[PDB]
Amino acid sequence: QQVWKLVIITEEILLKKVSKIIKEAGASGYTVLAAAGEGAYSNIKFEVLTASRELADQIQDKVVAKYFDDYSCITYISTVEA
Amino acid sequence: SQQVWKLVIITEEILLKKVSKIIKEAGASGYTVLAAAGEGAYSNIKFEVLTASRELADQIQDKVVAKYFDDYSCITYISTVEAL
Amino acid sequence: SSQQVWKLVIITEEILLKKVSKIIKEAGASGYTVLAAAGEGAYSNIKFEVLTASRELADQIQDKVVAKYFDDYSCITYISTVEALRAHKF
Ligand SMILES: Nc1ncnc2c1ncn2[C@@H]1O[C@@H]2COP(=O)(O)O[C@H]2[C@H]1O
Numbered sequence: 171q172q173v174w175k176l177v178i179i180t181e182e183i184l185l186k187k188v189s190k191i192i193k194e195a196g197a198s199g200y201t202v203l204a205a206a207g208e209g210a211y212s213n214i215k216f217e218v219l220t221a222s223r224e225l226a227d228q229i230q231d232k233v234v235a236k237y238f239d240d241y242s243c244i245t246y247i248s249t250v251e252a
Numbered sequence: 253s254q255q256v257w258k259l260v261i262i263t264e265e266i267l268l269k270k271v272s273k274i275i276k277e278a279g280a281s282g283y284t285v286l287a288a289a290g291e292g293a294y295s296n297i298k299f300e301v302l303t304a305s306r307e308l309a310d311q312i313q314d315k316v317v318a319k320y321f322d323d324y325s326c327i328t329y330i331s332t333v334e335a336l
Numbered sequence: 337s338s339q340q341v342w343k344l345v346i347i348t349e350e351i352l353l354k355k356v357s358k359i360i361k362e363a364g365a366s367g368y369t370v371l372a373a374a375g376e377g378a379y380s381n382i383k384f385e386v387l388t389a390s391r392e393l394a395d396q397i398q399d400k401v402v403a404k405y406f407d408d409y410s411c412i413t414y415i416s417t418v419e420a421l422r423a424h425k426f
Pocket residue numbers: 197198199200201202217218219220262288289290291292296325326327
């Protein structure tokens with residue numbers, strides 16, 4: 171019941187593209203919340219729970235490779251108990 | 253100092269008052285709600301409830317899941333954090 | 337391939353947005369995220385999330401906000417750890 175929580179915080183423009191990467195990669199779902207900040211609720215925070223670290227890592231590695239340079243994004247991973 | 257538990261519940265908006273009732277009636281210090289959307293559209297809510305005792309978190313959790321999980325789209329998980 | 341970073345959360349009334357933001361930046365944080373929130377102790381609270389690679393940085397921010405506002409406003413704070421890619425700077 172120990173799963174991994176992937177977080178992606180990125181510009182709101184990427185809502186469909188990032189949720190595509192999540193859905194296709196095989197995640198059972200995702201959560202998304204409106205967010206603001208610096209680095210106006212112009213961003214979104216993705217939360218993807220996955221049964222395996224490797225899946226979380228694969229989603230993050232694709233999102234980062236495709237979008238980290240041309241859009242402002244951060245991402246991190248933690249573990250939770252389900 | 254002091255390790256507390258973070259119970260997260262994600263359910264749809266209409267359970268807001270019934271779930272908050274369960275949290276308060278279980279004797280939690282309080283709770284935090286954020287608006288959220290997702291797939292498993294922004295008419296779901298995310299509860300976060302922090303508790304000194306994993307006991308308290310687990311009861312609140314089972315009582316919510318018993319009453320509503322089968323009939324409503326709903327997820328939950330627990331982690332630990334460091335409070336003051 | 338991963339590095340430990342600390343995540344500081346502060347939940348306060350929305351009116352404290354400008355003051356708390358300024359305390360985060362003045363301590364040298366690379367950034368912060370804010371979400372709108374409601375709760376009990378409609379979305380008239382705010383949740384800050386501040387990631388940093390030094391627990392000392394997180395401790396300074398937390399100590400200053402607690403000292404300044406936790407008497408006069410209803411707030412909570414906590415800290416946990418997360419993992420980030422080494423390639424990223426926090
Ligand atoms: N794997 C997952 N990761 C993160 N959030 C999820 C996951 N599965 C379900 N959820 C959340 O739980 C909610 C249940 O109802 P919804 O499908 O409307 O929206 C869902 C998401 O917000």
